[PDB]
Each structure stands twice: as C-alpha cells, then as structure tokens.
Design a protein around this ligand. Structure first.
Ligand code: NA
Ligand code: NA
Ligand code: NA
Ligand code: NA
Ligand code: NA
Ligand code: NA
Lengths: 252, 252
C-alpha cells in the first residue's frame, strides 16, 4: 500500500512571521494517528523559521522554485538556496502559478527536471478548467499535462515525485466537485502513468486530491481507492488540518 | 543635494545561506566614506538572516513583492511578510522580471501603489531595449513606463520612491553603454518627473544608474550631475561593492 500523503499548502499566508510561529506551535502539539507522510509548504520568507521550529517527523516544502541554480533572475529563489536550509520538497505547477503568474508546461517540466536532478522531491500539480470539464475532455487535458511532465522526470527519480490533481473548474466557478470526481481523476492519472511508464511506477506514485479538503469531507475522500492523500489549501492554516492528516486511517 | 543612493542587488545569488552569511560579514567590515544611503537586496529565503546580521546603518530590501497582502497566491511573498521582519524596501520592475517572468506595467503599478500605501519604500526600475535605442526612441519608451508609474504613487509618498534606469539594450546584446548614456537617461527621467509632477519632486527623487557598474567606472558615473547613485548587479556580491558605495564622494 502506498504511504498516505498530506501536504499543507499555506499559499501566501500568513501575513506575519509571528503568526507563522503560532501556527507551527499548534502543529507541533498535534496527535497524528495511523501512518502518514506530512509536508508543510510555506512562503519563502518563513521557510527558515519553519525548518528550524517545525516538528522533525514532518518535512518542510517550498511553494515554488526557479529553473536554475542561481544567477540573473531578480526576485527568484532557487533549489540550492532551499537545500541550504535542509529543505527537501517543493510544489510545482500549482494552478495559481499557472494561471496568475502564467507558468507554462515547458517552464514547469524544466523546473521538475532541475529540481529532481538536484535531489529535491516535488509535488507536481495538474488539472483542468471549467470548459474542458463541461466538454467531457478532462482526461484528455490532464493527460497532456502529465505527458509533458513525464519526460522531465530523470531515471531513478519516480520515488521522489508526488502528483496533485486540482479541479480548477471547481474554483470560483459556481460549481463544486464531488467525492466521485476526485476518485475518477486520480484513477485517470494512475492509468496514464501505467500506460506511459509502467505499472510498477503507477503503483508507487502517490496521487493527491487538491480540491477543497476540509474536516467535513476528508474521511470520505481518503477512502477512495486511487486517492493517496491531499494537497490542502485553507485548512492547512487551521486546527482542522490535523483531522485531514488523520484521515489516512480511512484509506486502504 | 539629494543623498547619494547605492543598492546592491544580489539577484538570485548566492546559492547558499552560508555564502550569504560570509558576504554579510565582509560588508559589515567595510569602511564607508562620505554620505550615502546603502540598501542590500537579497533572495527571500536569505532575508531573515540578512535583516538579523547586516550592519544596522544599511537597510535590507526584497527583490520583488506581490500585489496583495496575503491569500491564494502559491509561491508569492507579500509586503506584510517582509515588513514582519522589519524590512522596509523592495525592488520592483527589474528588467529580469519584466522580461523573463513577464511582469507588465499594469502589474507593476499595482505593486508600487500597494507597497507604498503599506509603508514600503521602492526602487522602481525602467529602461528600453535594443530596438528603441537604435531607433532613437529611448526617451519615449522610458517616458511611457514612468507615466504608468506616476499615477500609482500615493499622495505624500514620493519621498519613498527611488527610480533605477536599466540600459537593457546593453545587456547581452553586443553593445555597451557609455558614461554619457547614463547621464542623458537619468536627466530624461528627471525632466519627465518635473513636467508631470513638478520640480520640487523631481529635485528630490533619486534616480539611479542600473547598467553595469564596477570599481573601474563607478567614480566617473557618480560624477554625472543627474546620476544619484546605482542599482548594482554582480559587483554587489564582491568586495568591489564598497568602492561603488564610496563613489558618492565624486558626486555633487
Ligand atoms: Na469524454
Ligand atoms: Na530514486
Ligand atoms: Na485512498
Ligand atoms: Na529621438
Ligand atoms: Na511621505
Ligand atoms: Na551624480
């Protein structure tokens, strides 16, 4: 059985380092049940304090990295800088970066390859927008994203890759995703992997649900067979985050 | 006389926090001559250690910020997060962000307004590319950029604005900028300000040269009448940075 995986994506929150520290202290007191791999992703400026203060059985993640080790890239943070603090993870391809900062698949594949070849682990995000959902072309769209990601992954590095599905069609559109939607799309992804890189890799890669996950749905979601965990949004800043970590006991 | 201003833009360097600390210790031992306002800008992940360790007569700067205080903006760092560490400055509109990360003038004006209204000081960058230089349309291009910036600046906030001119046409093009180029464009900018917001503001705003500045040209550049200082690239990571800070004694 793949180890259940929960990443808390703080996104661009909280506003202050003091709030970040308060949040860390709460996470540090949380009683985790079952077996689960927990990763906490935070704004670059809070990464040193999170790496310093966060419980050592959890790991810290960046929310992005650039494509190069260093250089003439004002404003960008790079893998070596992250690693210098002992941080081992980054998110890549989040819908907010693809949409608002205009990150394209070519840029993202270059980041996945560079990250992995430099010893990072990645949470690689994908997912379709409203029109493709309506057209019944979700699988196709998600497939093309995964097919762009596949060639990026170096030999021997699938152990260091986690994929998160984001129902972007359910974000601010007036439409909501169901538990079955999550299961269907995670299965879609696993089957793409199986066809393209083989069953052994498909069976080991954790595929996460990255839509709205809260204490009131995490248990039903976790129980879905192809849902291996979550990339949590707003609840990662709240006490309910622990409920979501602990939903691993409902997944088999 | 406006106070001479030198910002050291580390860009996406160095690779490691240990190197950042070594660099800070060197800057901390530097003997500054004359009167000069020095600002050091570094990757978000190194900002806490720079704010902690850097000499207190200099100020720390971010190399970018987003347009909002916080929220669903995975990967982005915001003004409140910066300010929570006591950091008072950010760069905005650097050529590398405009070009590689596709930041447009509307995005940049929104960042200048938000930054300033939240108590930040900004180093706002502008400058033309090769074709406009060749066409003799540099003033026009730079004017439009400044005209997009002007409406962003809140009432009472020009004391918190510094402008840097970047000869992007001289970056990786096979062409080099002269000392006279720098003086001519800084004068161009001052005169735009005078016409658009008045002589009192034009006479107080520091306008920096942001092309290649090194120990072998900083003194001649500084002496130019409309050059009020520098936004330094690669030399800000080198001992020569102090020579450049100290060139203020040649500016009147
Ligand atoms: Na279909
Ligand atoms: Na491996
Ligand atoms: Na499951
Ligand atoms: Na002309
Ligand atoms: Na003021
Ligand atoms: Na001068």
């Amino acid at each position: 059985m793949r180890t259940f995986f929960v990443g808390g994506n703080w996104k661009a929150n909280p506003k202050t380092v003091e709030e970040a520290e308060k949040l860390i202290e709460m996470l540090n007191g949380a009683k985790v049940e079952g077996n689960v791999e927990v990763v906490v992703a935070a704004p670059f400026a809070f990464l040193p304090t999170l790496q310093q203060k966060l419980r050592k059985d959890w790991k810290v993640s960046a929310e992005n990295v650039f494509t190069k080790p260093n250089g003439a890239f004002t404003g960008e943070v790079t893998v070596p800088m992250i690693k210098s603090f002992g941080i081992e993870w980054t998110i890549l391809g989040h819908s907010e970066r693809r949409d608002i900062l205009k990150e394209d698949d070519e840029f993202l594949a270059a980041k996945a390859k560079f990250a992995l070849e430099n010893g990072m682990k990645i949470i690689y995000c994908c997912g379709e927008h409203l029109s493709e959902r309506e057209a019944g072309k979700a699988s196709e769209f998600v497939s093309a994203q995964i097919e762009k990601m596949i060639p990026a992954i170096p030999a021997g590095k699938w152990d260091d890759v986690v994929i998160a599905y984001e129902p972007i069609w359910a974000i601010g559109t007036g439409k909501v995703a169901s538990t079955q939607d999550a299961q269907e799309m995670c299965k879609v992804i696993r089957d793409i992997l199986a066809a393209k890189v083989g069953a052994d890799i498909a069976n080991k890669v954790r595929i996460l649900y990255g839509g709205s996950v809260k204490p009131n749905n995490c248990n039903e979601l976790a129980a879905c067979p192809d849902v291996d965990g979550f990339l949590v949004g707003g609840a990662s800043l709240e006490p309910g985050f622990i409920n979501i970590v602990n939903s691993n006991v409902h997944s088999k």
